[PDB]
Hints:
The chain is α+β, with helices and mostly antiparallel strands.
Amino acid sequence: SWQAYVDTSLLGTGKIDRAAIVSRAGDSVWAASAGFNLSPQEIQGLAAGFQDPPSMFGTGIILAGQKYITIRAEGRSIYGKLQKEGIICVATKLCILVSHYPETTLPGEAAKITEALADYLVGVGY
Ligand code: NA
Ligand code: NA
Ligand code: NA
């Protein structure tokens, strides 16, 4: 299940405290961890971000009612920071992985893990 990816593969690392998997077109949430609610406006904006990544620097990244400073924005990867916390968003063929990381994990760790789950999903065809 997509929930199994959120629970086991992302949250189960101990380095990502909140996660979601959303359609790549930004029309729905396929799976999300408890209390991490991404509005239709937020996922549509993020999806639009992958189609015009330089624009994400001006707007920042708004997810679950919180704005993050845009640190990386490219075709498949959009990263944000909020002090020592942040989010990693990676587009696969069919989905977008969203990973929030807390104070105690390095951005590099969180990026590495969700980039990896992304390539895996691309390899499988999703
Ligand atoms: Na900003
Ligand atoms: Na990258
Ligand atoms: Na990396």
